[PDB]
Amino acid sequence: MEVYYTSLRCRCVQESSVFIPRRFIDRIQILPGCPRKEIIVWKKNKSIVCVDPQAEWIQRMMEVLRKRSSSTLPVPVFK
């Protein structure tokens, strides 16, 4: 799915829902002036893609990355 936004307030005018495998992704920006949330994917081949925030795969990948930023911490020590 591809969505086009006549709106002039957001930098993402065109969003895609097509799956982007994790191995080709460098980084993902989350933007909560623009009245809607944006997810901008920086691919490993220097291209940029705005992603449909409602796509299932991107919600699943974000859940994984958020759960991992607390799972590779050093193991605390007590007493």
Author numbering: 2 to 33, 37 to 83
Q: What text does the study give?
A:
We found that both V1M and Δ1L2M CXCL13 functioned as agonists, with EC50 values of 5.64 and 133 nM, respectively. In terms of efficacy, V1M CXCL13 was the most efficacious construct other than WT CXCL13, attaining 93.6% activity at 1 µM, whereas Δ1L2M CXCL13 was only able to achieve a mere 55.1% activity at the same concentration. The loss of contacts at residue 1 are a likely culprit for the significantly decreased efficacy of this construct, suggesting that residue 1 plays a critical role in triggering the activation of CXCR5. We were also very intrigued to note that once again the N-terminus of Δ1L2M CXCL13 formed additional β-strand interactions, although they were different from those seen in the Met CXCL13 structure. Specifically, we observed that the N-terminus of each monomer exhibits an extreme turn away from its core domain and then folds into a β-strand (β−1) which interacts in an antiparallel fashion with both the three-stranded core β-sheet from an adjacent monomer as well as an induced β-strand formed by the N-loop within the same monomer (β0). By aligning the seven monomers found within the asymmetric unit of the Δ1L2M CXCL13 structure, we were able to observe that they are all extremely similar prior to their C-terminal ends, with only minor fluctuations found in their N-termini and in the β1–β2 loop region. All monomers exhibited density beginning at the N-terminal residue Met2, with the exception of one chain that began at Glu3. The final C-terminal residue varied between monomers, with the shortest monomer ending at Arg72 and the longest monomer ending at Lys83. The alignments also showed that the largest observable differences between the monomers was in their C-terminal regions following the α1 helix, also known as the C-terminal extension.
CXCL13 is the cognate chemokine agonist of CXCR5, a class A G-protein-coupled receptor (GPCR) that is essential for proper humoral immune responses. CXCL13 is an agonist of CXCR5, activating the receptor, resulting in downstream calcium signaling and ultimately the chemotactic response for which chemokines are named. As elucidated from structural data on many chemokines, this conserved tertiary structure consists of a disordered N-terminal region (6–10 amino acids, referred to here as the chemokine N-terminus), followed by a long loop known as the ‘N-loop’ ending in a short 310-helix, a three-stranded β-sheet and a C-terminal α-helix. Furthermore, we were able to utilize two of these mutants to solve the first uncomplexed crystal structures of human CXCL13. These structures allowed us to observe that the core domain of CXCL13 (i.e. everything except its N- and C-termini) is fairly rigid, whereas its N-terminus exhibits striking flexibility as well as a propensity to form both intramolecular and intermolecular β-strand interactions.
